[PDB]
Design a protein around this nucleic acid. Structure first.
Ligand SMILES: [Mg+2]
Ligand SMILES: [Mg+2]
Ligand SMILES: [Zn+2]
Ligand SMILES: [Zn+2]
Ligand SMILES: [Zn+2]
Ligand SMILES: [Zn+2]
Ligand SMILES: [Zn+2]
Ligand SMILES: [Zn+2]
Ligand SMILES: [Zn+2]
Ligand SMILES: [Zn+2]
Ligand SMILES: [Zn+2]
Ligand SMILES: [Zn+2]
Lengths: 131, 505, 505, 131
RNA sequence: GGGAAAGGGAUUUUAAUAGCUAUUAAAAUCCCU
RNA sequence: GGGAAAGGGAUUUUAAUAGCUAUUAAAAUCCCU
């Protein structure tokens, strides 16, 4: 019964995240130690004509970005664990995430390490200009 | 490359995959969105919201290696070194039903302490805003043998209470034994899935109130503590996991355990299975194959207990040799062949099951060899035989006495851990039917330099007096004997032993 | 007066009394010091120091009255109102031996929760500098029936640990039920002596962390807390005490309990005696003599459960009246004789065991009375009979379902407390062998002003549709039915009931 | 076996003190409410020619005092409970206590309410002079 | 469970799609429930 | 207990001391251990 969802290569890191107290630090330590990043992310085909904001309701990637499904690039959705955000609601689910092309290797690490600017909704240090 | 796993399986009854903005993986997306180049597209279709899909937790694998993170699935040798942390663990579960099909959730947890916890069916539910750990529909497993699980579906409590109860039970059990916890399981595939509900892992931590290793984690306080400071803590921190089935066993748990033990019989329950699992692990590690080189750390007054045991052995063996005027002494159970006493000139012989020196002959004792050693004085100091001869001097650990260095064992016996691990068979008085319990007494020959007692066989007590030297000797021997006896050791002697024969000196 | 009591008896073996400067009372002074006018004199004799005399704790009497201090030994009427706090209590003890003779100390404490605590022999010792609560010599009671107490002498733990364990167990049991604790004992003479080890009394206190009544006291913190905040607390604060033997029973506990119950049979242990004591108290207070005027406070959605029960009763009784062509209805178990439903015009009759109105006839129902009511539809809403008739509609509480308003009872039954206390016999499926389990369904006749289900017997479902009014009614009835069923109630009906006969409207 | 020590009339209050968190406050409340004071105290025959200090190794009562056995006028010795003093050692045991004649009714209440002066060892407000 | 849609894995064998493997579907043995 | 000196109470009866009661000592019944 049911239908399979995850590859066996991601099972070790996802179990580690499922058991750890702090999933973000554990995943960052796993990636920085040479472990394989999370594969099986949802990648979107876009004409690269978007505005380029971080999180959007429809794909908005520019020529220097790639659009990903939000739920596939959130560590708490991948591991199916409780989100730490306000009222337990994920900010990535139902929305598409723009990832810079230079960091296409590990979308989950980028979405954990960086946060968008609250004024212009771009990634800080990766497109945000507020000076 | 593309080997799929049953972990995080979508157990809902929906026949179509999720939208690309909601699906957690690529292969969970519905096929109408996917393209040729392994890309996904947005078709501007209406969103299928809200939704609620049960997500399976079957198939965790804790085999990743991160610097600073301890190895939790320990091997055989590390499990042996951590024998004081061994807590058996079994789970009986309920199958998800109604809106869900294809996963199991824990229903009854059972530990080797004899404790069963019944929980409500709780699983992971993925919804359009995130995910929850909430109640799901579940039925007891079908068939005859699981009928006893039918009432338990309506006797379970909430998980946040059961977590604190489990942490409290583990703190009560393992506080004086170790700073660690080691779940000894028979099939870890479901035990680890259930442990994901009440365990947390991470870097090795220190207790907030003291210097002990942190073994419990509190979420509302976001803090770590050891067993003594884990009041109100709802999570177990860094538990080791051991699988007995990986150790070469063939067949189910019951047939393997019943081959070596007849005491843990009873009704079917999770705690009894956990007890059988721990018993089988003890039999595997300390009876069949035994490692003599593994040394355990001291907890409390173990060196003192060894010194007192040596003093009592010297006194008792000297007195038993002098009474009855034995000339030949056989020591059955001396690994090194070192004489215990040498003041009476007697001919010593040594035997052992696994001798460490060629001067000691092999002897796996059986009562049919009673006449082989009938012409002397036999010695059974910490040597365990189901039937002792009539001419014996025996010291045997009573397994029914609770002690820090006494752990539950196989076939009603006990594991005695004092610098080494010895498996002792269950204390049965019927083995001593040809022997009498040795009464307390003292004996000495030291030169002299109030206390009234008729068992202090000395030069002063012959004349009805006592001196200061013999007084302090007798008092310190009383302390040593009290420590030895309160630790659990029992002393038995041949029937014809009379203390009044010791008055000759 | 000069009537002496056995409390604080000097249990030492010394024949001579103490000097006036050391003796606690006048009559404990040695007779060589006493003179006329009931006075003592100092004779300048050498002081007999040091010394160590065991002091008995047998014969406490908590009958003093101080303003602000609650009455702890409550009466029958006050114990009935505190039924949610009832915890059984038995103690098995060891007799003081060696340097002490004439007192008993607790050895095994047992509670109605089924747990047993084994303790080391600890008593009060009076010494020349004061007094201690330290280990004393004690032996198990002689005779055959106490042989099972012989191993327990070497399986006991330290009292400060057992205190915290007892407080933790009582916190786990009584947290959701009440702010109070009530020890139900069979003979309080030794139970109170044992309670002096782990209980403290005083003025009524408030919890440090919340507004609940303080039920536990911590000595290192000198603090008071309720059950939710009693982590690490040593003592139980202000427990009520109840003696079942004072209620007119003659004979020992076993012969009185075996006259009314056959479920609590087993081996002899303190916890089983405590369970038998609580069972006998429940039988005395809620089966033999019943008080209808004592209302109990609401603790968890009792009003909502009552409303849902009334809704479900109305629906199923209307449906049972309309499916079959019954023109005569008997209601066996209606205290007031108020018709449940009146939309179908049928001839109602009422009966009850203890009717509150002359319009209701008396009927202590027995299975031989089936032929007296065989011509009509019998109704058994919360009326318990060991054997139900063929044409019955029955609602019965399943005593095996864990609920906050459900408590353990007599003979395997349960005490259901919802504004009143009802004793329900043990749920046996053999009583309903002539009936079938009533399937879930809804029936309505309200005017019409997605949802697909075949059990919604309405006007819209005849045409394959559903309306907003019937959808909301169906959802709220599903909520009511779910609450009623999850509380524990089970519905059974006569065999010839078919929902398809309800499609006539 | 053993020998009896206490009267039944004192068995009530001594039970209360055996259970209360604060024995001194409970005993004072019991006495002030009209309850019977503790009887059975050891009273010493003295020639009334002593110095008059509070606690002494031999009887020292003046004409306005009475000598009592210390262990019989200490509440923690009467009830056989743990003393609250320094290192658990009773200050009254083995020594005789002088009680003023005007408070001869309740020796235990006087020994719980008052405290000797650390300079001259007399009862404060009852013979102590340190102005 | 009071509650239509009877669970998870390992090994072997079989058949199909794709460019010997991954997935899909079935049978047999064993373990957990 | 591994460990010489076998426990607590209620009722009734009997004997002794002192001026019907308190204590001491014993027997019978019942309860706790
Ligand atoms: Mg099992
Ligand atoms: Mg009992
Ligand atoms: Zn998320
Ligand atoms: Zn910005
Ligand atoms: Zn600590
Ligand atoms: Zn076993
Ligand atoms: Zn000497
Ligand atoms: Zn509180
Ligand atoms: Zn019963
Ligand atoms: Zn309608
Ligand atoms: Zn004192
Ligand atoms: Zn002064």
């Amino acid at each position: 019964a049911g239908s399979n969802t995850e590859f066996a290569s991601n099972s070790s890191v996802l179990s580690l995240v499922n058991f750890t107290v702090d999933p973000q630090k554990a995943y960052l330590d796993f990636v920085n130690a040479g472990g394989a990043p999370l594969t099986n992310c949802v990648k979107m085909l876009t004409p690269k004509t978007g505005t380029g904001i971080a999180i959007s309701v429809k794909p908005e990637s520019t020529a220097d970005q790639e659009t990903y499904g939000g739920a596939s690039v959130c560590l708490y959705c991948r591991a199916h664990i409780e989100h730490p955000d306000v009222s337990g609601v994920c900010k990535y689910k139902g929305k598409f995430v723009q990832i810079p092309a230079q960091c296409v290797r590990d979308p989950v690490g980028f979405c954990l390490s960086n946060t968008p600017c609250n004024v212009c909704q771009y990634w800080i240090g990766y497109g945000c200009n507020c000076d | 490359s593309q080997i799929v796993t049953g972990l995080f399986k979508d157990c809902s009854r929906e026949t179509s995959g999720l939208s690309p903005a909601y699906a957690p993986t690529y292969v969970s997306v519905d096929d109408k969105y996917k393209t040729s180049d392994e890309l996904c597209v947005n078709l501007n279709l209406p969103a299928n919201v809200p939704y609620s899909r049960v997500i399976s937790r079957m198939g965790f694998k804790l085999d990743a290696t991160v610097p600073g993170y301890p190895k939790l699935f320990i091997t055989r040798e590390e499990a042996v070194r951590q024998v004081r942390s061994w807590i058996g663990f079994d789970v009986e579960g309920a199958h998800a039903s109604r809106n869900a099909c294809g996963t199991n959730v824990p229903l009854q947890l059972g530990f080797s302490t004899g404790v069963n916890f019944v929980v409500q069916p709780v699983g992971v539910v993925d919804t359009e805003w995130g995910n929850m750990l909430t109640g799901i529909a579940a039925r007891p497993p079908p068939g005859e043998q699981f009928k006893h699980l039918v009432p338990l579906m309506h006797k379970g409590a909430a998980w946040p209470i059961v977590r604190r109860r489990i942490v409290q039970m583990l703190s009560d059990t393992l506080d004086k034994l170790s700073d660690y916890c080691t779940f000894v399981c028979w099939a870890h595939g479901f035990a680890l899935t259930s442990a994901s509900y009440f365990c947390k892992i991470g870097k090795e931590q220190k207790c907030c109130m003291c210097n002990r290793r942190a073994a419990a984690y509190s979420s509302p306080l976001q803090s770590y503590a050891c067993w003594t400071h884990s009041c109100g803590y709802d999570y177990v921190y860094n538990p080791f996991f051991v699988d007995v089935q990986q150790w070469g066993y063939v067949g189910n748990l019951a047939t393997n355990h019943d081959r070596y033990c007849s005491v843990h019989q009873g009704a079917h329950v999770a705690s009894n299975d956990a007890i059988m699992t721990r018993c089988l692990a003890i039999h595997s590690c300390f009876i069949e194959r035994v490692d003599w080189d593994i040394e355990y750390p001291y907890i409390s007054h173990e060196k003192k207990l060894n010194s007192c045991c040596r003093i009592v052995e010297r006194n008792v063996v000297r007195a038993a040799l002098l009474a009855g005027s034995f000339d030949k002494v056989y020591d059955i159970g001396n690994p090194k062949g070192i004489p215990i006493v040498d003041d009476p000139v007697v001919d010593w012989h040594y035997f052992d099951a696994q001798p460490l020196t060629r001067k000691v002959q092999q002897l796996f004792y059986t009562e049919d060899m009673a006449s082989r050693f009938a012409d002397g004085l036999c010695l059974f100091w910490n040597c365990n035989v189901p039937k002792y001869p009539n001419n014996a001097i025996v010291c045997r650990f009573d397994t029914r006495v609770h002690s820090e260095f006494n752990l539950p064992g196989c076939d009603g016996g006990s594991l005695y851990v004092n610098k080494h691990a010895f498996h002792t068979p269950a204390y049965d008085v019927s083995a001593f039917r040809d022997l009498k319990p040795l009464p307390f007494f003292y004996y000495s020959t030291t030169p002299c330099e109030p206390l009234k007692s008729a068992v202090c066989i000395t030069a002063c007590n012959l004349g009805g007096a006592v001196c200061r030297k013999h007084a302090t000797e007798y008092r310190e021997y009383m302390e040593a004997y009290n420590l030895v006896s309160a630790s659990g050791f029992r002393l038995w002697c041949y029937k014809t032993f009379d203390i009044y024969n010791l008055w000759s000196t």
